[PDB]
Amino acid sequence: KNPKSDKFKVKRFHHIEFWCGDATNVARRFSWGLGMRFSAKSDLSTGNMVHASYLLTSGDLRFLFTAPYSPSLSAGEIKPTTTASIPSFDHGSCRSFFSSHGLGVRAVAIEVEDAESAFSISVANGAIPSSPPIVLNEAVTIAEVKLYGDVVLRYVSYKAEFLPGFERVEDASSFPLDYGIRRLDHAVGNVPELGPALTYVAGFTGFHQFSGLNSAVLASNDEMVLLPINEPVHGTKRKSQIQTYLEHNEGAGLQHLALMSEDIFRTLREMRKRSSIGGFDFMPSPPPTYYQNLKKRVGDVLSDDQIKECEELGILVDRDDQGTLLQIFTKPLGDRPTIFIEIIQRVGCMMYQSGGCGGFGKGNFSELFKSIEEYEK
Amino acid sequence: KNPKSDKFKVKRFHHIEFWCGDATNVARRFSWGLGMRFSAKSDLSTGNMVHASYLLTSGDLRFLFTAPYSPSLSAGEIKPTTTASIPSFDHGSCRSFFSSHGLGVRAVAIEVEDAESAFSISVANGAIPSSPPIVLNEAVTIAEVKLYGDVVLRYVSYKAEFLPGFERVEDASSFPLDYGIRRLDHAVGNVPELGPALTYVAGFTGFHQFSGLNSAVLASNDEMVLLPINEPVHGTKRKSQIQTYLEHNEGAGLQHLALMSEDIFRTLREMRKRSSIGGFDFMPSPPPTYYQNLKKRVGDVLSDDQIKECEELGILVDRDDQGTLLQIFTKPLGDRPTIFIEIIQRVGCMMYQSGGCGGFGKGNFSELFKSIEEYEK
Ligand SMILES: CCCC(=N)C1=C(O)C[C@@H](C[C@@H](C)SCC)CC1=O
Ligand SMILES: CCCC(=N)C1=C(O)C[C@@H](C[C@@H](C)SCC)CC1=O
Ligand SMILES: [Co+2]
Ligand SMILES: [Co+2]
Hints:
The structure is a homodimer. By secondary structure, chain A is an alpha+beta fold. Chain A has two domains: 10-173, 2,3-Dihydroxybiphenyl 1,2-Dioxygenase, domain 1 (Roll), CATH 3.10.180; 181-376, Roll (2,3-Dihydroxybiphenyl 1,2-Dioxygenase, domain 1), CATH 3.10.180. Chain A contains ten helices and 17 strands. In chain A, the strands form two sheets. Chain A has a nine-stranded mixed beta sheet with strand order 6-7-8-5-1-4-3-2-9. Chain A has an eight-stranded mixed beta sheet with strand order 11-12-13-10-14-17-16-15. Chains A and B meet through helix 1 and helix 2 of A and helix 1 and helix 2 of B. The complex binds the ligand CCCC(=N)C1=C(O)C[C@@H](C[C@@H](C)SCC)CC1=O (2 copies) and cobalt (II) ion (2 copies). Residues 188, 215, 228, 230, 283, 316, 329, 342, 360-362, 364-365, 368 of chain B line the site of one ligand T9O. Chains A, B: Its EC number is 1.13.11.27. Chains A, B: One of its GO terms (biological process) is tyrosine catabolic process. Chains A, B: Its cofactor is Fe cation.
C-alpha cells in the first residue's frame, strides 16, 4: 500500500556530505577504498576561504567531504560577501559537530523540483529549519531542515557541474577508479525513540511507511528515496548495538549508508583486495552452514557457483516475496563504532527496478542465529 | 665545529605524533601513500576509553596518529585511574590543537637515556614544561616540554613493544608495505622570530648550531637529531611561504618532516604510482635545464643514467664539501598549505654515515632560479 502522499515532488538522492576534520585525508581514503573518482573541488585554490570541500563520484553516487579552514582567513567576510560555496556552512557548527560526533554524515541531500517550495512546505508541516533557501548563481537552490540529531535533510533543485563555485578536477589528479558502485540505495538513522522520529519526518515530508532494535522505513512516492530509522531495545543479554551507537556518537545520527553495486561480486573483490592497504574492512563472514542453507532459500535464483562466490566474499542473501537481496557490511568507517557502509545488489521486481526490491535483510537475523547454532553442531 | 654541549644524553629520533580528528582515516591514507605498515594500536579494543592511537612503521621511522573519543566515555576517570596509554593526552588540548592548526605534528619524540633527568635538566635550563615525567608499567618514562607553537619535544627512555598499553597489530590487518623509507632525518619548525626560538631551544638542550626565509639548524652531539628552524623574510615580491604557513597554521608549528630512504628512486617510483589513488602528490618538477646543469655539478657522483632517473622522478640534487643530497618535496599533507614531507637520500661522509651529510639543499635556491631563467631561454 503506497498512498503517494509526498507533500512536494522528490526526485532522487543527490549527495551525502561528511563533516571532517581534514577533508583531504578522508576523501583520499574513501576514494581508494570504495573506487570513487575525484570529480569536483571547492577550496583555497578555487577562492573559497571558508571551507575545503571535495566531491567523489561513482556512477550517480556523490560523496562530499568538507572541513573548515581557520576562521581567520575569512574574518573580514559577512554572509553577503562570503567566499563559501555552500552558504549553509558555519565554522562553529562544523567544529561542534565533529567534536561531538567525530567523522560522520552531516547532510542527506535529495534533489527536488523546487527547493524553496520544499523548504516552505516542510516547515509549514513541522520541520525544524536549519538553513533557509539560498539561490546560487541564479542556477541552483539549496535549503536544509533538521532530520535527526545533528543530521540535516538538504533539498537541492536545479533550474536546468555539482554546485556553482565548485571546479571540475584536473584529469591528472582524477584517476578513473570504479569498483562497480552506482547509487545510494538507502540511508539509515539511529535515534533514542523511533515513534517520535517517524512522526516528525513523515509529518513534514509525506513519506509513507514502507534483535536489539525496532525499525521502520520511510519512502518517497516512487520509493526511490528510502530512509530507515532504528531505535534500541533495552534489557537484552547482548547489549543493543543501536544503544552502543548512541553512546559513542553522543546521540542520534546516521548509522549506515547502503550503496548499490551493479556487480556486487566485483565490488567486493576490489574492496577486499584493499582492506589492508588503506581501504575498508568487512564484518566477519557467516559460517559455512549459512551458505549450505542458501541452497534451500535462494537455490532458484543463484547457481551453486554463484552461491560459492557469495561464500568466498562473505556476502549475505535475503529474499522477500518480490525479490532477492545481496548485501554485506563494512566495519566502522572511522575511529568510533558509529557509521559504517553496506554494499547491496537487488535482483527482481522488474517493470527499471522498483525501489526496495527484496527488502532490507530482516530475514538474516534469524538465518544468522540459526546458522551459528547449526555450525556449533 | 661541534662543541658536544648536550646537557643530557640523546640517542635518536623515536617517533612523530600527529594529532588528528579521525586517526583511522589519516593513518590508512599515510600507510598507503608512504608504504608504512600498521604495527601497534591503543584504542577501545585495547581498553583505552580516552584516545584512539595507531602506530605506523617503516624501518626505524615511527608515525603515531591520535584522536580523542567522546569525553563521556571516560567521564568517571581521574588521572590516577586513566585508561589512556599516553598519559600526557588531554581531550581539550587535542581538540583545541586541531581546531586551531588542523592536521599536524603535536610531538617530536626523541629517545634519551633518562627522560626524568632530561626533563629536569631541560626545565632547569629554561624549557617550558608541558607534561611531567610519568613512568609507564615500570618500563618506560615519558616527559614533554614546549618546542615551538603548540609542538612539544617528547623525551622517551626505556629501562631495557612501542609503549605499555599498546598492542601489536594482528598480521591479517598488518600488510607488509615498504617503499624504502627507513628513518627520520630532520624535522623543521616555522616560527615568527628565529633568534628567540634558537636561544630558547639551544638554551635548554645544549644542541649546537649545525629567499623568503632565514634559517638555522640545531643538532645533538653526534648530529643525528637535527632540528632546523625557519623565520619569514618580509617585503619580497613573492610572498614568503614561511609567512603563508604562519597565517594558515595560526602561528608557529612543524613545517616539514624529512624521511630518509635507502633507495630514493624506488621510493619515488612507488609513491608517484599512488599519488592519484589515495597517496601523496609532489611539487612540480624542475625544468629540463636543471637536469642538464646537473652534469657539471654532480656528474662525478651520479652516472648519466642515474641523472636521467632523477629527471623522470623530479628529484633535486645538491652538494656541499662533504657529501651529496638527493631530495624531493610533497605537496601539503592535508587541507591547509602547512605541513609537507621531504624524501631524501644522502651519499658520502662514510666513517656509518655522519649526520647531515650534504647539508639540507640550500644550494638549490640559486640552482632552481638559474634553471628557471635559463629554461625561459
Ligand atoms: C534500518 C533497518 C533497515 C536496514 N537497512 C537493515 C539493515 O541493513 C541490517 C539488516 C540486519 C542484518 C543484515 S545484520 C547481520 C550481519 C536488517 C535491516 O533491517
Ligand atoms: C629549514 C632549512 C633546512 C631545510 N630542511 C631546507 C629544506 O629542506 C628546503 C631547501 C630549499 C629547496 C630545496 S626548496 C625548492 C624545491 C633548503 C633548506 O634549507
Ligand atoms: Co541496510
Ligand atoms: Co629539509
